[PDB]
Curated annotation (Swiss-Prot):
Alphabetized Gene3D superfamilies for the sequence: Phosphoglycerate mutase-like
Keyword annotations from UniProtKB, A to Z: Hydrolase, Protein phosphatase
Gene that this polypeptide is encoded by: sixA
Superkingdom assignment: Bacteria
Organism phylogeny: Bacteria, Pseudomonadati, Pseudomonadota, Gammaproteobacteria, Enterobacterales
Gene Ontology cellular component annotations, sorted alphabetically: cytoplasm
Organism: Escherichia coli (strain K12)
UniProt keyword Hydrolase, yes or no: yes
Name of the protein: Phosphohistidine phosphatase SixA
InterPro entries, sorted: His_Pase_superF_clade-1, His_PPase_superfam, SixA
Role this protein plays: Exhibits phosphohistidine phosphatase activity towards the HPt domain of the ArcB sensor involved in the multistep His-Asp phosphorelay.
Enzyme Commission code: 3.1.3.-
Any single GO BP term: regulation of phosphorelay signal transduction system
Keyword Oxidoreductase: no
Record-stated family: Belongs to the SixA phosphatase family.
Length: 156
């Protein structure tokens, strides 16, 4: 199963509180940039998992505007910055055994980095710039391979 791990886009520093910080114009722009790149890669997203935080959901909105995404999305509490990478890993393994062919995961630091390591043996937490995407091929036994990583700058 193809897993695409994405860090939410650039977000405003100030808001009533952290969970509600909106995306910035640039954050939107770059998120659409990465979305179109994926579209050009013949990427077909079957399932979507997103953090409950506004910046994650908005990144999803923006992406969904350029890439054909599922009508629904699953808002996961464990995708927040302090999310339990173990439960995220298990959720992904579940979908893998379910038959799901591909999933797009939109989250935050430091979770995104740890998630890749947790899923892929021998890998250290990679560095994620905003809107950057990590590709991981996960098998039924929870064994994942870190394929590549793409960021708005390596396209820009
Ligand atoms: Ca469009």
């Amino acid at each position: 199963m193809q897993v695409f791990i994405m860090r939410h886009g650039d977000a405003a520093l100030d808001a009533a509180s952290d969970s509600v910080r909106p995306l910035t114009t640039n954050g939107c722009d770059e998120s659409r940039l990465m979305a179109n790149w994926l579209k050009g890669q013949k990427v077909e997203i079957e399932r979507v998992l997103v953090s409950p935080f506004l910046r994650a959901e908005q990144t999803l909105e923006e992406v969904g505007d350029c890439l054909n995404l599922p009508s629904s999305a699953e808002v996961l509490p464990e995708l927040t910055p302090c999310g339990d990478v173990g439960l995220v890993s298990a959720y992904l393994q579940a979908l893998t055994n379910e038959g799901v062919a591909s999933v797009l995961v939109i989250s935050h630091l430091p979770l995104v980095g740890y998630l890749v390591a947790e899923l892929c043996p021998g890998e250290t937490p990679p560095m994620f710039t905003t809107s950057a995407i990590a590709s991981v091929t996960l098998d039924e036994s929870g064994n994942g391979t870190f394929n590549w990583q793409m960021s708005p700058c390596n396209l820009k």
